[PDB]
Amino acid sequence: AALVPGVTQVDNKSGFLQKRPHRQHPGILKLPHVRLPQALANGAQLLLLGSAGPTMENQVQTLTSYLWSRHLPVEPEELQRRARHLEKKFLRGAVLHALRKTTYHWQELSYTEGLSLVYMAARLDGGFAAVSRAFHEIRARNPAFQPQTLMDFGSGTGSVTWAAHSIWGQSLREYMCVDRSAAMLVLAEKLLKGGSESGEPYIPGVFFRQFLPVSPKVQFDVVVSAFSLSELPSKADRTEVVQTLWRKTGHFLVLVENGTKAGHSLLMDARDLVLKGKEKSPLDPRPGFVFAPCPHELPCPQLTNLACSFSQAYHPIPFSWNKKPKEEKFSMVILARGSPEEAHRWPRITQPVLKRPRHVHCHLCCPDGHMQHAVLTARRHGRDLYRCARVSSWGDLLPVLT
Amino acid sequence: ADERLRINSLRRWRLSRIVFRHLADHGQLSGIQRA
Amino acid sequence: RRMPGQCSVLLFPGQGSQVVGMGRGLLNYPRVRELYAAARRVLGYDLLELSLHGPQETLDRTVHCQPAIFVASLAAVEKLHHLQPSVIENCVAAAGFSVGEFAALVFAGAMEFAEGLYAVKIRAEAMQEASEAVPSGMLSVLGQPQSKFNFACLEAREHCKSLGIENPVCEVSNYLFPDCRVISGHQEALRFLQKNSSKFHFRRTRMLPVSGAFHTRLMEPAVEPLTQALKAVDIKKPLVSVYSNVHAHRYRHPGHIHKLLAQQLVSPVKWEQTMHAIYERKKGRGFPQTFEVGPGRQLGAILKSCNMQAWKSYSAVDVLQTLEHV
RNA sequence: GGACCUGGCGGUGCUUCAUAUCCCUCUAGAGGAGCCUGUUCUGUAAUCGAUAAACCCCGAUCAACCUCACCACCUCUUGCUCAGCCUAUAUACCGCCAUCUUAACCCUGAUGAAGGCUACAAAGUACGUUAGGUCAAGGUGUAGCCCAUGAGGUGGCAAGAAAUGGGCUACAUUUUCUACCCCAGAAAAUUUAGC
Ligand SMILES: C[S@@+](CC[C@H](N)C(=O)[O-])C[C@H]1O[C@@H](n2cnc3c(N)ncnc32)[C@H](O)[C@@H]1O
Ligand code: SF4
Ligand SMILES: [Mg+2]
Ligand SMILES: [Mg+2]
C-alpha cells in the first residue's frame, strides 16, 4: 500500500511540478510506436523475396502461436506427483496414457535454414520492440550510462544488436552475439550487410560465436537475453546459463521473455537466483538489485496465480500479411550491479490504466512488496497526483512519497 | 414497444456457426448435407 | 430525404465571364427592369446600356465587370424561376466563384440587393486601386503529372529576388480542376514561368485578361475598405447551403460570413474543393441538376473536368438570347 | 597391438538428363489532383475524445449555438425512494470465440560381427492449456465511492507541420448525348496480380 488517501503526496524533486507539466512527469516511461531501422526492414524483406507467398503467411502464424503458448518443460519432480495422484485415483500403462494428456509435450526446435526465415518473419519486429522498451528503461532513468560493451546470449536474428545500436550507438564498441544454430548466425550477418551475402556491416564490432564463453575475467557492460531462456531443455540449463550471464555482467543484466505465465515464472526463477547469491567468493563481489520493473527485491506478489507483463506497440515490417500496428506483450527483469541509487523508489503500474469520469484505476506493485488496486480521484488524493495518474500509462512509475 | 411504434408513426437455425457445424456435420440437422 | 436527381445546385460565375450583349434575353423577363433600376440608383451610372451595348474595354475594367456579373447572375435567377419554379424550389446548394459568392448569398436571403451592390462596388473600386498600387497579374497553367507547382513558384520568386524587390509574390491563387491552376503575382515571375514552362513541366500557359493579382496578399489594402462596407450590413442565416471559397465548406453561422468574405479577398479560391464537397458520392449514386446562373459557361467546363458524371446533368441559363418572347 | 564387419558420412564436388516452383514470353492496370484516416514531432491547463445519447435530412458531412468526456473554478448532500455511479472484475464463474498439447518364419557365412538378388531366374516367403478475446443482441456472483467514483453551475477546450501506410471520387474518342438495344443523328520506372 503506497497510496494512502490524504497522506501520500507527489514527490517534487528537481522542482518538477513548478517547472514542467504533468504529461512529462519523470515516471513517464511510455515509448512511442516503435519503427524498425530502414536498413533492417529493407534487409528482412529482401531476404524473403524467394518465398513470401500465401504459404509463408500460414507458417508465420503457426510459429507465432506455437511459441506464444509454449509451457516451461515439466521437470521430473512435477511428473511423479502427477503420476502418483493418478495412480491412487486409478487404484502403470494406464497412468502414462492419462499423463500424455493433461501434460505439455515440450520439444526442441532445430532452427534450420527454413525455420530461421519463418522466425525472422514472425519475431524480428516483435522482438525488437520488446527489447527497445527494456533498454529505454535504462536510458530514461540513467541517461549518463554510456556502455561500451554488450553481449547477447541467444542471438537469433540480431534484434538486440540493432536495438542497442539505436540507443547507445555512439558509445558501444563490441557486440558479442552467441547462438548455437549455424543458420541463425548466417541469417544474422546477412541482415547486418543489407540482406546480402556480400557487403559492409551496418553496425561495427559485431562478433558472432556458437558457444557461450565461460570466464569471470571477461565482463560485459550490458548482458541481454531475449526470448531465449525458454528454448533451453530444462531448469538445470536455465540455472547454469543465468549464473554465467550474471558473472559476466558489468552493470546491467536484461532478461526478456514472453508475457505469459510460462515466461513470467521463468524470469522470477532467474530474479531470485541472482538476488540470492550462492557463490562463496566471486571474482566480482558486488551485490545485485532489481533495476526494473520491480520496486523491491522481495518475492513477486503476482507469481502465485497471475503473471506480470508489459506492452509495447510497434509498426510491423511491411509484408503481405502485416497491415495494422501490433502490440508486443512481454515480461522483463533488469538486474543491476551495486545497490539501489536512493531509498525513494516508486510504484510500478503493471496493468492497463483505465480512465473513467473523475477517477482512474491503477494497479501498482508497491515498494513494500504488495500489490495495491488504487482508484485515484482528485477529492481523495489531490489535484496533482490525480493528474499524474490520469496521464500515466501501463508500465510507468507513479511519483508518490510517504 | 407499442408506445415506441406509435410515436414513430406520429413523426435460420439461431445457433452459433460452430454448433451448427457439429450438428450439421454429425447429421443432427435434418436435410443439411455437404455439397 | 429527397432523391438525388430532383434537387438542384446553382453555380454563380465570377471575374472573366463578362460578355457584350449580356442581359439581352433577360430584360423582358419579370422583375429584371427593377433590379437594373436599383443598380442605377446605387451605382450612379447605367449598367443596362453598358452591358447591352459596350466597347468591351469599359466592360473589361474591374470597376464595371463585377457589378455587371452580379446583376446578370441575379437576373438569370429570376429567368430560371419564371421558366422552372420547381428547380428554384428544390435547391440544395449554392456556390459562387469570386464575386459570384456575393450573388449566391443574395439568392440565399442572407443579404439584400442594395447591400450586395454597395459591397460589390466598394470591393471592385478597392481592388482596382490595389492593382494600380503595384504591377501584377495572373496566369492560368495546365500541368502534367510531372509538374511541381510550389517548386515553380519558388524559382519564380528567386528570379524576382535576384532582380530586386521587397518580398516577391508568386503563389497558386485558384485551384480549378486536376492539374489546372491559376498562379498570381508580379509580372516578371509569371513571365519567368511562361519562358521556363518546359523545365517546370507546364503543358499550357495563358495570361488571364485581368488588371492585377487577385486572391493574393497584394490585395491587402483593399481588405479594410470592404470590411467597413460589410460592417453595416446585417447578414442573416442563408436559406440554402451556400459554400465558401476560403475553405470550401458550407457556412455554419452568419457571424462568420463577415470575416470570411474579407478573407476571400486575400486568399486562394478553393473551387476544386467546393466541387468535391458538392458532388462527391459513391459509384452509382445519382447526381443533382446543375444550373450555371450567369454569363458564360466556364463553370460548366470546370465541372466537366472535375466530375464528368455530375456534368452529365448540367445546364446553363442563356443570358444572351431567349427562345420565347414572354 | 593384428584382421575383419556394419556403418554414419547431419558430407563434398563434377557428368548427364526429368527440371516442374522461379526465369524469359502475354494481358491489365498501380505515379498525378482533391479530401478522410493510421503513426511521428511540436503545442496547450484541456481529449482535431464520443452520440443503443446531437447537428444532418440530395449525397455525405464538419464544427453543432445539445448532452456525456477533459481543464480551471465553485455550490449542495442525508440527499431519492435504507439513495445514487455505470466504476472494476469473464486478471471472479458460466456461456460464446480463439491459442497450444494429447512382426513372424526360412536359408547363408564352419551357427562371428553379419548377409539373403539374377525371370532363358541362382533363397527368400510372409481432455487439459491460457495474467487469451468477448458485459452489443446472454446470464450468476464478487468487490469499490457514498460531505463523493453522486447531483449541479460558471468559463475554457474544438489543435499546427511534415514523411510515409491505407482508403473514397473524376480521369473520353474502341469516348459522350438521344432513338433503339447494335445498318441512325449530333457532341467534342519499378512492381502488382492474372491465366
Ligand atoms: C528464440 S531465439 C531468440 C531470438 C533473439 N533473442 C531475438 O530477439 O531475435 C533463441 C536462440 O537461442 C539459441 N539457443 C538455444 N539453445 C541454446 C544453447 N543451449 N546455447 C546457445 N544458444 C542456444 C537458438 O539457436 C536460437 O537461435
Ligand atoms: S513488477 Fe511487481 S508484479 Fe511485476 S514481476 Fe516485479 S514484483 Fe512481480
Ligand atoms: Mg481475460
Ligand atoms: Mg472537444
mmCIF file of N, CA and C and ligand atoms in Angstrom, chain A residues 264 268 293-294 296 300-302 308 365 371, ligand 2:
data_model
loop_
_atom_site.group_PDB
_atom_site.id
_atom_site.type_symbol
_atom_site.label_atom_id
_atom_site.label_comp_id
_atom_site.label_asym_id
_atom_site.label_seq_id
_atom_site.Cartn_x
_atom_site.Cartn_y
_atom_site.Cartn_z
ATOM 1 N N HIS A 264 6.755 -15.442 -17.290
ATOM 2 C CA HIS A 264 6.933 -14.694 -16.050
ATOM 3 C C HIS A 264 7.554 -15.560 -14.964
ATOM 4 N N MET A 268 11.202 -15.012 -12.840
ATOM 5 C CA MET A 268 11.240 -14.912 -11.385
ATOM 6 C C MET A 268 12.183 -15.947 -10.785
ATOM 7 N N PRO A 293 11.487 -4.293 -13.552
ATOM 8 C CA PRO A 293 10.406 -3.357 -13.245
ATOM 9 C C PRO A 293 10.014 -3.353 -11.777
ATOM 10 N N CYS A 294 10.584 -4.257 -10.997
ATOM 11 C CA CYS A 294 10.151 -4.403 -9.616
ATOM 12 C C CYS A 294 10.718 -3.275 -8.758
ATOM 13 N N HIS A 296 11.233 -3.589 -5.646
ATOM 14 C CA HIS A 296 11.684 -4.282 -4.450
ATOM 15 C C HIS A 296 12.417 -5.553 -4.853
ATOM 16 N N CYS A 300 7.855 -11.930 -5.754
ATOM 17 C CA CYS A 300 6.813 -11.365 -6.599
ATOM 18 C C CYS A 300 5.436 -11.601 -5.985
ATOM 19 N N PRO A 301 4.613 -10.562 -5.802
ATOM 20 C CA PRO A 301 3.270 -10.788 -5.255
ATOM 21 C C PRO A 301 2.261 -11.292 -6.276
ATOM 22 N N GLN A 302 2.604 -11.319 -7.565
ATOM 23 C CA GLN A 302 1.701 -11.782 -8.613
ATOM 24 C C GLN A 302 2.083 -13.157 -9.146
ATOM 25 N N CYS A 308 2.958 -11.133 -14.672
ATOM 26 C CA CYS A 308 3.314 -9.724 -14.763
ATOM 27 C C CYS A 308 3.968 -9.498 -16.112
ATOM 28 N N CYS A 365 2.415 -2.264 -8.234
ATOM 29 C CA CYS A 365 3.334 -3.060 -7.431
ATOM 30 C C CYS A 365 4.127 -2.086 -6.567
ATOM 31 N N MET A 371 0.864 -5.730 -3.977
ATOM 32 C CA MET A 371 0.070 -5.041 -4.982
ATOM 33 C C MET A 371 -1.015 -4.205 -4.321
HETATM 34 S S1 SF4 E 2 6.897 -5.525 -11.025
HETATM 35 FE FE1 SF4 E 2 5.821 -6.442 -9.216
HETATM 36 S S2 SF4 E 2 4.335 -7.935 -10.177
HETATM 37 FE FE2 SF4 E 2 5.889 -7.453 -11.797
HETATM 38 S S3 SF4 E 2 7.421 -9.053 -11.622
HETATM 39 FE FE3 SF4 E 2 8.123 -7.275 -10.341
HETATM 40 S S4 SF4 E 2 7.354 -7.705 -8.212
HETATM 41 FE FE4 SF4 E 2 6.234 -9.069 -9.673
#
